[PDB]
């Protein structure tokens, strides 16, 4: 070759994973969440860096600081409400991502699946510390009760909760830590994303049918660049619709109140993206039992590869799992509901059966259904 | 575990996506806060920057901000020799410091109104239905004098003196100062101190909606332009067999 810009630079060749790559034809709209996933990572970052261009990480000021970003600073208001709302999107997008993987068996790509999982959990940490930066009543308490929930561990716990906090409570020491880790996680996560992409590039994108498409492959540039741009267009739409018309709507927490360590919103809860795991935790009387089961909520993802029982990696051709897949999703919705519920009889009893349903759906029902379907097909 | 009553979706000029804030209301409301409310509740993030937000001129608010620094002035802030003039000063703190504040109101601590609308669950509805909601304690109920009964407080009891009562103040123009009429104006000024960007953001909304209605359709066509070859495509299979 001569003057083929792409492979001339070696660097520019590495970018031909976007333009020249084999991309399956058939492909639900669901896959745009990968790309959007990145979109969100880049938006949070640009946004973060500007907010962290006018934010301070002290008890005294932090609330003020945010308050000042939203008042005196030019276009700081949208930047901040764009950053808050974004993170919602970021999660809304994440959970589409994992749904798709669950449903079409994209998770067969074990190595890719394991990175995903790390991805998911890393963002999860990020979101947990950022929300505490503004140091408002919800944030303040939410950190205590989550962090303390780590003191369940018998031997260490206790010592360890105190190291993480940098003291006995959550004063300045903790507050500056979260500021620093919030800042540096996303950068580390981008490396991961790319590592994730790396592995995925070695086997390409699965499809709704569930079969290899090698016999049908398309230009990523021609087709999938417009799709992705279009995806954006809708993604942004949702992010501005939220951010411009209903800034606070999705941000359940109304606690714009500077944190007073004796005061407490009897209704303490993580934002929507954490409710599942909250609910699941409450269902267990015992503290430690609840922390294990909380971890297992999320950490149970990496099992599913091994659970796979059918011969069709595609759920597309299998009824019964399509029914229990949906139910889990609706069980997951049910759990999210509990999250914002008084912890009383009505909700308790419900959550408890939802938390068993979720683990049944994942651990026991689906796997059996797999088998059955295989046996009805005579496979 | 007491039922809490909840606020109506009270008819507001701004309830609607494009609806915006009514400054005259703001204006009025302001005074309400300043005469009725400055006494025990503070508004720390609010400067004397109503100018364009509240239609008070620069000269108007300068003057309005001057007398407030002459009486409550920077002597309560720590500017020994400070008097009339300044505009960077923030609304004057009812009391030196919180602890005091609770003493004046006996254990209770007058919440900073800056964000009340956006703070407390339930927005300006709650705030309006609190002030305007004050009914007779319920047969068989007991009440410590401070504990006035209010139909909309979580714990079913609030330490609030006559928030607002008819003819509490008087507005320049002549707006009929009804308990409620004044509340409608007081809330509105709160709405705004809670979210000063209210109007700009709804504006942009408008411009983001039009734009997006031109880009969404456009961009979709692009997407079909390109893909068309694929979708229009037809296939044939001819083995030698």
């Amino acid at each position: 070759m001569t003057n083929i810009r792409k492979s001339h630079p070696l660097m520019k060749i590495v970018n031909n994973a976007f333009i020249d790559l084999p991309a399956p034809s058939n492909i639900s709209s669901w896959w745009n969440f990968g790309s959007l996933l990145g979109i969100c990572l880049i938006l949070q970052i640009l946004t973060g860096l500007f907010l962290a261009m006018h934010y301070t990480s002290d008890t005294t000021t932090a609330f003020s600081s945010v308050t000042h970003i939203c008042r005196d600073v030019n276009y700081g208001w949208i930047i901040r409400y764009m950053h808050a709302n974004g993170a919602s999107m970021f999660f809304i997008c994440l959970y589409m991502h994992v749904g798709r993987g669950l449903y079409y068996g994209s998770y067969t790509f074990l190595e890719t699946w394991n990175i995903g999982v790390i991805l998911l959990l890393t963002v999860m940490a990020t979101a947990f510390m950022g929300y505490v930066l503004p140091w408002g009543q919800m944030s303040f308490w939410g950190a205590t009760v989550i962090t303390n929930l780590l003191s369940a561990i018998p031997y260490i716990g206790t010592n360890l909760v105190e190291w993480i906090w940098g003291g006995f409570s959550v004063d300045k020491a903790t507050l500056t830590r979260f500021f620093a880790f919030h800042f540096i996680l996303p950068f580390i996560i981008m490396a991961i994303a790319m590592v994730h992409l790396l592995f995925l590039h070695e086997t390409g994108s699965n499809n709704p049918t569930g079969i290899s498409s090698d016999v049908d492959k398309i230009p990523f540039h021609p087709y999938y660049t417009i799709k992705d741009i279009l995806g954006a267009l809708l993604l942004i739409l949702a992010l501005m619709l939220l951010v411009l018309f209903a800034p606070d709507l999705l941000g359940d927490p109304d606690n714009y109140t500077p944190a007073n360590p004796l005061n407490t919103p009897p209704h303490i809860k993580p934002e929507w993206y954490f409710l599942f795991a909250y609910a699941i935790l409450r269902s267990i009387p015992n503290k430690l039992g609840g922390v294990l089961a909380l971890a297992f909520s999320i950490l149970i993802l990496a099992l599913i590869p091994l659970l796979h029982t059918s011969k069709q990696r595609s759920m597309m051709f299998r009824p019964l799992s399509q029914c229990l897949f949906w139910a889990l999703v609706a069980d997951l919705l049910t759990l999210t509901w509990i999250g914002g519920q008084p912890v009383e009889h009505p909700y308790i009893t419900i959550g408890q059966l939802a938390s068993v349903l979720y683990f049944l759906l994942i651990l026991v029902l689906m796997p059996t259904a797999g088998t059955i379907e295989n046996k009805l097909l005579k496979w | 575990s007491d039922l809490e009553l909840h606020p109506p979706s009270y008819p507001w000029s701004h309830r609607g996506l494009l609806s915006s804030l009514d400054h005259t209301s703001i204006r009025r409301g302001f005074q309400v806060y300043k005469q009725v409310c400055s006494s025990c509740h503070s508004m720390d993030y609010v400067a004397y920057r109503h100018l364009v937000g509240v239609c008070y001129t620069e000269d108007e608010a300068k003057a309005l901000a001057e007398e407030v620094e002459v009486q409550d002035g920077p002597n309560e802030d720590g500017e020994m020799f400070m008097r009339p003039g300044k505009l960077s000063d923030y609304f004057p703190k009812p009391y030196p410091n919180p602890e005091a504040a609770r003493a004046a109101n006996n254990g209770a601590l007058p919440p900073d109104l800056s964000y009340i609308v956006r703070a407390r669950h339930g927005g300006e509805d709650y705030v309006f239905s609190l002030l305007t909601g004050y009914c007779e304690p319920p047969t068989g109920v007991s009440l410590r004098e401070g504990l006035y009964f209010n139909p909309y407080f979580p714990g079913q009891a609030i330490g609030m003196a006559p928030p607002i009562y008819n003819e509490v103040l008087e507005f320049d123009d002549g707006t009929p100062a009804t308990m409620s009429q004044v509340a409608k104006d007081v809330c509105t000024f709160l709405r705004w101190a809670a979210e000063p960007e209210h109007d700009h953001r709804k504006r942009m909304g408008l411009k983001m909606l039009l734009m997006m209605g031109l880009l969404l359709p456009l961009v979709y066509a692009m997407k079909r332009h390109k893909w068309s070859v694929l979708k229009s495509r037809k296939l044939a299979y001819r083995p030698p067999k």
Partner: peptide, 26 residues
């Protein structure tokens, strides 16, 4: 779209009404 978006993000640095309030007022 890009123009305003970018512009907002740069004015976000230009000069905060906080500071600018005191500017030119002595």
């Amino acid at each position: 779209a890009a123009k305003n978006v970018v512009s907002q993000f740069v004015s976000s640095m230009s000069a905060s009404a906080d500071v600018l309030a005191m500017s030119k007022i002595e």
